[PDB]
Motif scaffolding. Structure first.
Motif, PDB file in Angstrom:
ATOM      1  N   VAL A   1      16.358  15.553  -3.636  1.00  0.00           N
ATOM      2  CA  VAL A   1      16.028  14.580  -2.599  1.00  0.00           C
ATOM      3  C   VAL A   1      17.307  13.997  -1.990  1.00  0.00           C
ATOM      4  O   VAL A   1      17.374  13.730  -0.782  1.00  0.00           O
ATOM      5  CB  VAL A   1      15.132  13.442  -3.161  1.00  0.00           C
ATOM      6  CG1 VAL A   1      14.962  12.324  -2.144  1.00  0.00           C
ATOM      7  CG2 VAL A   1      13.774  13.986  -3.585  1.00  0.00           C
TER       8      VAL A   1
ATOM      9  N   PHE B   1      15.222   8.553   5.184  1.00  0.00           N
ATOM     10  CA  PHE B   1      14.515   9.676   5.782  1.00  0.00           C
ATOM     11  C   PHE B   1      14.030   9.358   7.188  1.00  0.00           C
ATOM     12  O   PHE B   1      14.840   9.195   8.102  1.00  0.00           O
ATOM     13  CB  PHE B   1      13.349  10.079   4.886  1.00  0.00           C
ATOM     14  CG  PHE B   1      13.723  10.169   3.444  1.00  0.00           C
ATOM     15  CD1 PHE B   1      14.598  11.144   3.006  1.00  0.00           C
ATOM     16  CD2 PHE B   1      13.228   9.263   2.529  1.00  0.00           C
ATOM     17  CE1 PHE B   1      14.959  11.224   1.679  1.00  0.00           C
ATOM     18  CE2 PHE B   1      13.586   9.338   1.199  1.00  0.00           C
ATOM     19  CZ  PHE B   1      14.452  10.320   0.774  1.00  0.00           C
TER      20      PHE B   1
ATOM     21  N   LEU C   1       9.069  15.907  -1.013  1.00  0.00           N
ATOM     22  CA  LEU C   1      10.164  15.013  -1.352  1.00  0.00           C
ATOM     23  C   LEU C   1      10.109  14.558  -2.812  1.00  0.00           C
ATOM     24  O   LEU C   1      10.042  13.363  -3.097  1.00  0.00           O
ATOM     25  CB  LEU C   1      10.142  13.807  -0.409  1.00  0.00           C
ATOM     26  CG  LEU C   1      11.459  13.124  -0.035  1.00  0.00           C
ATOM     27  CD1 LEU C   1      12.460  14.137   0.482  1.00  0.00           C
ATOM     28  CD2 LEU C   1      11.205  12.047   1.009  1.00  0.00           C
TER      29      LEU C   1
ATOM     30  N   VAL D   1      18.565  15.992   0.805  1.00  0.00           N
ATOM     31  CA  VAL D   1      17.777  15.718   1.995  1.00  0.00           C
ATOM     32  C   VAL D   1      18.276  14.455   2.690  1.00  0.00           C
ATOM     33  O   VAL D   1      18.438  14.430   3.914  1.00  0.00           O
ATOM     34  CB  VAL D   1      16.283  15.569   1.656  1.00  0.00           C
ATOM     35  CG1 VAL D   1      15.492  15.184   2.899  1.00  0.00           C
ATOM     36  CG2 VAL D   1      15.747  16.862   1.048  1.00  0.00           C
TER      37      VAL D   1
ATOM     38  N   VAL E   1       8.043   8.913   3.191  1.00  0.00           N
ATOM     39  CA  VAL E   1       9.004   9.539   4.088  1.00  0.00           C
ATOM     40  C   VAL E   1       9.082   8.810   5.430  1.00  0.00           C
ATOM     41  O   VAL E   1       9.990   9.049   6.220  1.00  0.00           O
ATOM     42  CB  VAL E   1       8.661  11.030   4.325  1.00  0.00           C
ATOM     43  CG1 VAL E   1       7.647  11.183   5.444  1.00  0.00           C
ATOM     44  CG2 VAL E   1       9.916  11.815   4.643  1.00  0.00           C
TER      45      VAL E   1
ATOM     46  N   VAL F   1      12.596  20.690   3.781  1.00  0.00           N
ATOM     47  CA  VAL F   1      12.353  19.700   2.743  1.00  0.00           C
ATOM     48  C   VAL F   1      11.154  20.114   1.893  1.00  0.00           C
ATOM     49  O   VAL F   1      11.217  20.068   0.666  1.00  0.00           O
ATOM     50  CB  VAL F   1      12.108  18.304   3.349  1.00  0.00           C
ATOM     51  CG1 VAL F   1      11.812  17.289   2.253  1.00  0.00           C
ATOM     52  CG2 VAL F   1      13.304  17.871   4.183  1.00  0.00           C
TER      53      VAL F   1
ATOM     54  N   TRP G   1       7.102  20.437   5.866  1.00  0.00           N
ATOM     55  CA  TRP G   1       6.271  19.655   4.957  1.00  0.00           C
ATOM     56  C   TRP G   1       5.165  20.530   4.372  1.00  0.00           C
ATOM     57  O   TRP G   1       4.254  20.951   5.085  1.00  0.00           O
ATOM     58  CB  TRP G   1       5.689  18.450   5.695  1.00  0.00           C
ATOM     59  CG  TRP G   1       5.371  17.261   4.826  1.00  0.00           C
ATOM     60  CD1 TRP G   1       4.134  16.728   4.586  1.00  0.00           C
ATOM     61  CD2 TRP G   1       6.305  16.445   4.102  1.00  0.00           C
ATOM     62  NE1 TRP G   1       4.242  15.639   3.756  1.00  0.00           N
ATOM     63  CE2 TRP G   1       5.559  15.444   3.444  1.00  0.00           C
ATOM     64  CE3 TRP G   1       7.694  16.465   3.946  1.00  0.00           C
ATOM     65  CZ2 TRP G   1       6.157  14.474   2.641  1.00  0.00           C
ATOM     66  CZ3 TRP G   1       8.284  15.502   3.147  1.00  0.00           C
ATOM     67  CH2 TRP G   1       7.515  14.519   2.504  1.00  0.00           C
TER      68      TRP G   1
ATOM     69  N   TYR H   1      11.321  17.663   9.514  1.00  0.00           N
ATOM     70  CA  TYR H   1      11.104  18.125   8.152  1.00  0.00           C
ATOM     71  C   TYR H   1       9.997  19.170   8.095  1.00  0.00           C
ATOM     72  O   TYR H   1       8.933  18.994   8.688  1.00  0.00           O
ATOM     73  CB  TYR H   1      10.737  16.970   7.225  1.00  0.00           C
ATOM     74  CG  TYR H   1      11.846  16.001   6.891  1.00  0.00           C
ATOM     75  CD1 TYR H   1      13.141  16.182   7.361  1.00  0.00           C
ATOM     76  CD2 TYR H   1      11.591  14.898   6.082  1.00  0.00           C
ATOM     77  CE1 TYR H   1      14.150  15.278   7.039  1.00  0.00           C
ATOM     78  CE2 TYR H   1      12.583  13.999   5.758  1.00  0.00           C
ATOM     79  CZ  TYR H   1      13.858  14.189   6.234  1.00  0.00           C
ATOM     80  OH  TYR H   1      14.836  13.281   5.898  1.00  0.00           O
TER      81      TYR H   1
END
Ligand code: FES
Ligand SMILES: [Zn+2]
Length: 396
Positions: A169, A215, A155, A172, A209, A152, A190, A188
């Protein structure tokens, strides 16, 4: 003894998308961690699965660390986009290396590993959000995948990712929903400090998130963005098209992000999270909506709020897996069951609770558990049986 990671890289693959401007080889997260032991090892092994896993096993054994329980980690992010034969062969190679014997097929290697010395109790695959549909997920089940790391990064569709082409997004959200509906663990990647972002923006998205039902991953793998020589970010830094966060800034942001994580989340860097409460414990329940379904986080914790075990129980929006007629059309999913040193019966207690909740509160017919192959026996000793990759049990 705990579970030992065995991280191996796939071969440099071309970009999944056709683009005359895209780089020769697909961008990996490991492009910005070039001095990691595993990537150097991979390069020295010409990215061969068998050789990498064997080497890693010898290294671990030489450190004096245990190898009875292992989690395989397939790194790259583009693995599922490669040729099918290469994928099945790569996985088969890994299991062969764990088993010490070469099998006829992937399934034989898996069945052998169910009782081997080096058990594979988990298999983690890195993949991009846009390379994660029903087909890919089914292949991952064939591989015996327990956990997926989604790239990801951040986001927001207006923020530059570190991979070529990037993703949306929506991708995702969809990928996360599908991963959950098949009973997998979701982490995820990050990356704060991405081009076109701000510490404030990163913090806001980090907060988002864990509030948005679309999510809410089980874990965050934090990659602090930084200008690595030999990369494109280096060039942007040269051109002044990118300036990295100062140390104090980045550290502050990481702290603030750790300060807002829910109880059910694990945080790792490449704090009240799961990893930070590892260590009489009592049973705790925490419900939260996710991907149209319900997630239930059961845990064993003492008055010091130190964690001793956890179980992730999903009440799915739909029954995507196919298990035949024996296990009904409505089935719960145990997406994780983890227990610290000692206990062991805490796992029994967690699982009993899960079964009771599914049978009574949500009126489900059966429970399915996407176990790692080296952990299947455990669940067999609890009344579960292997059906289509899952460890299932009728609720009575
Ligand atoms: S260079 Fe190919 S999508 Fe950007
Ligand atoms: Zn932590």
């Amino acid at each position: 003894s705990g579970v030992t990671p065995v991280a191996v890289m796939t071969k440099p693959l071309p970009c999944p998308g056709k683009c005359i401007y895209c780089p020769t080889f697909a961008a990996t997260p490991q492009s910005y961690t070039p001095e990691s032991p595993a990537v150097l090892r991979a390069k020295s092994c010409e990215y061969q699965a068998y050789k990498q896993v064997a080497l890693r096993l010898r290294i671990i054994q030489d450190m004096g660390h245990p190898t009875d329980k292992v989690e395989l980690i397939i790194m790259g992010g583009t693995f599922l986009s490669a040729d099918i034969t290469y994928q099945y062969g790569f996985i088969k190679d890994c299991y062969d290396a764990l088993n010490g014997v070469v099998a006829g097929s992937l399934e034989e290697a898996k069945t052998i590993n169910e009782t081997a010395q080096h058990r594979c109790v988990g298999l983690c695959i890195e993949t991009r959000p846009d390379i994660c549909g029903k087909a890919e997920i089914q292949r991952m089940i064939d591989f015996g995948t327990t956990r997926v790391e989604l790239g990801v990064q951040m986001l927001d569709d207006d923020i530059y990712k570190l991979v070529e082409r990037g993703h949306r997004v929506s991708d995702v959200a969809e990928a996360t929903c599908l991963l959950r509906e098949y009973g997998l663990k979701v982490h995820y990647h990050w990356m704060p400090g991405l081009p076109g972002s701000s510490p404030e923006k990163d913090l806001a998205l980090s907060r988002m998130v864990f509030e948005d039902p679309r999510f809410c991953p089980d874990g965050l793998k934090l990659y602090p963005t930084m200008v690595v020589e030999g990369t494109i970010l280096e060039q942007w830094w040269k051109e002044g098209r990118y300036t990295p966060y100062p140390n104090g800034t980045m550290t502050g942001l990481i702290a603030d992000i750790k300060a807002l994580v829910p109880p059910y989340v694990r945080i790792s860097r490449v704090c009240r999270c799961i990893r930070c409460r590892e260590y009489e414990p009592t049973l705790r329940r925490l419900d939260y909506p996710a991907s149209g379904g319900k997630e239930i986080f059961l845990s064993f914790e003492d008055a010091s709020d130190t964690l001793y075990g956890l179980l992730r129980l999903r009440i799915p929006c739909a029954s995507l897996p196919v298990l035949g007629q024996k296990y009904g059309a409505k089935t719960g999913l145990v997406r994780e069951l983890h227990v610290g040193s000692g206990s062991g019966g805490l796992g029994r207690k967690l699982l009993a609770e899960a079964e009771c909740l599914a049978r009574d509160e949500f009126g489900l017919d059966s429970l399915a558990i996407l176990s790692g192959v080296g952990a299947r026996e455990y669940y067999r000793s609890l009344g579960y049986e292997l059906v289509a990759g899952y460890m299932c049990k009728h609720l009575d």
